[PDB]
């Protein structure tokens, strides 16, 4: 039937109506420290989130959003690998089934509890939709989770899963700042690949923070309970959506530190 990460449509049956799967510049993928080239010209990151305007949070049967007004140059990021200013439109996560999984990066192969990923447009394009036909249409930043300490700043997201449990619940969710969700350093990893979600368009710039932020067991549990179903269908729970490494093939990942 349609996409999704059960057994029978899982990232393993993608390609069959989403050709690009098998494309080149595929992600998730598995970053390798020593063989990661140390860029000197690349550039300090920019994140400019002071102005940032939430406006809902909606479970849309793959993941929870958190969409933010991009209307105009409220929550941009810019620096970097990048040429332009990319827009704030909205964050998710992807998170396992246990805590030994879940992240869709990798570091020499070790695999996080979860992976927020922030998605920011190529203004450049006018609008989000014109973005994702362009090899530099958007930028995503990336962040592993690991089990450790609560993360304060992450317990208003927690708090209104409880109305968004199924596929299509949307909810308000205004003056939530993302900055409580960033580590205390910007050191990165770049390389060019594509959504991990059909359909997988090659159209990002990756920004993978160096750094993991922690959240307690708590925390990431109650992202299990949420689900993939809609309201009054078998429950599903919403779990291992996470797609796997992708082979590199013909690129370089560039390291921002040495
Ligand atoms: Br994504
Ligand atoms: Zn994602």
Redesign the pocket.
């Given at each position: 039937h349609h996409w999704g990460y059960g057994k029978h449509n899982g990232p393993e049956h993608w390609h069959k109506d989403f050709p690009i799967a098998k494309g080149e510049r595929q992600?998730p993928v598995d970053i390798d420290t020593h063989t990661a080239k140390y860029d000197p010209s690349l550039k300090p990151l920019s994140v400019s989130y002071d102005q940032a305007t939430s406006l809902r949070i909606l479970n849309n049967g793959h993941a929870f959003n958190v969409e933010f007004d991009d209307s105009q140059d409220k929550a941009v990021l810019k620096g970097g690998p990048l040429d332009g200013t990319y827009r704030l439109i909205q964050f998710?996560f992807?998170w396992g089934s246990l805590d030994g999984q879940g992240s869709?990066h990798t570091v020499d192969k070790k695999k996080y509890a979860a992976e927020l990923?922030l998605?920011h447009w190529n203004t450049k394009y006018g609008d989000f939709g014109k973005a994702v036909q362009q090899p530099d249409g958007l930028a995503?930043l990336g962040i592993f989770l690991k089990v450790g300490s609560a993360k304060p700043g992450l317990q208003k997201v927690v708090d209104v899963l409880d109305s968004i449990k199924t596929k299509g619940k949307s909810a308000d969710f205004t003056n939530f700042d993302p900055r409580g969700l960033l580590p205390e350093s910007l050191d990165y990893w770049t390389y060019p690949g594509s959504?991990?979600?059909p359909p997988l368009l090659e159209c990002?710039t990756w920004i993978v923070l160096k750094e993991p932020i922690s959240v307690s067991s708590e925390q990431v549990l109650k992202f299990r309970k949420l689900n993939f179903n809609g309201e009054g269908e078998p429950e599903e729970l919403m779990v291992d959506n996470w797609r796997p490494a992708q082979p590199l093939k013909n690129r370089q990942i560039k390291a921002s530190f040495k």
């Open positions: 992600s998710h992807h869709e990923h998605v995503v959504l991990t979600t990002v």
